[PDB]
Amino acid sequence: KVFGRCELAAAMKRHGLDNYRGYSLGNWVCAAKFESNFNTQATNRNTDGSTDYGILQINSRWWCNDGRTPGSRNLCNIPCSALLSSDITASVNCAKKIVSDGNGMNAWVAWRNRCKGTDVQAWIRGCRL
Template identity: 50%
Template sequence: MKAAGILALIISLSIIAESKVYTRCKLAKIFVKAGLDNYEGFTLGNWICMAYYESHYNTTAQKILEDGSVDYGIFQINSFTWCRNVRRQQKNHCHVACSALVTDDLTDAILCAKKIVKETQGMNYWQRWKKHCEGKDMSEWKRGCEVS
């Protein structure tokens, strides 16, 4: 029993150690390289603003919702519709495990976010984007960043 407790502690510490919080400019570079700037008409500033308000740029952010689903990763992508976790039957439209959305490698999260924007009503999926970013000057979000 003691060994199981130690193993659980080691696993939880390794999860904490793997948590990455990007800086705004580092994220801007990653987003530009991934083709998010002007993707479906949304500027880089929209993506950076949305990621800030959804997760504060934390790759391992998770939020359990009242319906039992979970929002995952830097974009807070929901498990019920967009990814697969072990707890619920999901639609998994992004064809990805939810665990792939909470890693430092943002490839799966970005591909899924692109799918969400393309297949829904743009960035309206993200309520925090609607509240904090929609219709505002987005140029400040990339100011001071070299994003070529």
């Protein structure tokens, strides 16, 4: 499913991501834009052989199981495929664990490089929240 900007903001807010770990909703929408272009089916291979899945490109190296990432972990306890569903519940629950790992949203390189410090509030402009 390819979410609309405000449609994704609404979904994330409903699932409690707004202000989670102190990160405003726009930060999460921005991260999703550059990680997956709002497409829940997005998958991308990483240099180390792991793969990222879903709207927030969760890495199989530590968070989900895809059965092809040697020595990886499955800290969110779910198959990576479950992070590709039209319902973002699993991705949000897992993202909540990732952002609590210690480095906050820096866990998402794209967020650090393209969202961090910018006017992320623009990402939720015009939305009814």
